[PDB]
Amino acid sequence: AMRVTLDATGNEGSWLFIQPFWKLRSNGDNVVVGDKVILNPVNAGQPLH
Amino acid sequence: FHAEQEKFLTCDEYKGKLQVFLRTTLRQSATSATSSNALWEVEVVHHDPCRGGAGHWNGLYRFKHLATGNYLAAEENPS
Ligand SMILES: O=P(O)(O)O[C@@H]1[C@H](O)[C@H](O)[C@@H](OP(=O)(O)O)[C@H](OP(=O)(O)O)[C@H]1O
């Protein structure tokens, strides 16, 4: 896997796409509280596990 | 259309009785798998039998199979 850490300043590795985990949600739809999502790093490309 | 399985709700006769199921399709586009047996008419419950109109989230609904005319319902599972 690839490492996940906490950085005070931050960098491009903090960019995370929030993708729908349910088929009833599609890109461009508003995220509703209580929903299950996938946090996919933009550069790494592998979702948080 | 059940999105998670990407399948249409269909009612058809298997051996001698009508059963409700989700039909599996080999089409790449699941929504393109359209069949006449997967057509349902939406009925809004109203105190007036002859009155329809727009539905509401808090209202009651019935589903009628267009091809066969039966109504969707739930019964006891043998298992
Ligand atoms: O790609 P082709 O060679 O045109 O064949 C089509 C498709 O690939 C399936 O065989 C079938 O879908 P189902 O699995 O849903 O039967 C469809 O029938 P249809 O016309 O009844 O949709 C065919 O027309």
Curated annotation (Swiss-Prot), chain B:
1D-myo-inositol 1,4,5-trisphosphate binds at residues 23, 25-27. Expressed in intestinal crypt and villus epithelial cells. It comes from the Eukaryota. It is found in: Endoplasmic reticulum membrane; Cytoplasmic vesicle, Secretory vesicle membrane. Coiled coil: none annotated. Phosphorylated by AKT1 on serine and/or threonine residues. Residues 1-45 form the MIR domain. Homotetramer. Homodimer. Interacts with TRPC1, TRPC3 and TRPC4. Interacts with TRPV4. Interacts with SIGMAR1. Interacts with PML and AKT1. Interacts with IRAG2 (via coiled-coil domain). Interacts with CABP1. Interacts with TMBIM4/LFG4. Interacts with CEMIP. Interacts with TESPA1. Interacts with TMEM203. Interacts with BOK; regulates ITPR3 expression. Interacts with BCL2L10. Interacts with CHGA and CHGB. Belongs to the InsP3 receptor family. Inositol 1,4,5-trisphosphate-gated calcium channel that, upon 1D-myo-inositol 1,4,5-trisphosphate binding, transports calcium from the endoplasmic reticulum lumen to cytoplasm, thus releasing the intracellular calcium and therefore participates in cellular calcium ion homeostasis. It is linked to Charcot-Marie-Tooth disease, demyelinating, type 1J: An autosomal dominant demyelinating form of Charcot-Marie-Tooth disease, a disorder of the peripheral nervous system, characterized by progressive weakness and atrophy, initially of the peroneal muscles and later of the distal muscles of the arms. Charcot-Marie-Tooth disease is classified in two main groups on the basis of electrophysiologic properties and histopathology: primary peripheral demyelinating neuropathies (designated CMT1 when they are dominantly inherited) and primary peripheral axonal neuropathies (CMT2). Composed of a large N-terminal cytoplasmic domain (CD) followed by a juxtamembrane domain (JD) and a transmembrane domain (TMD). This is Inositol 1,4,5-trisphosphate-gated calcium channel ITPR3. It comes from Homo sapiens. The gene is ITPR3.
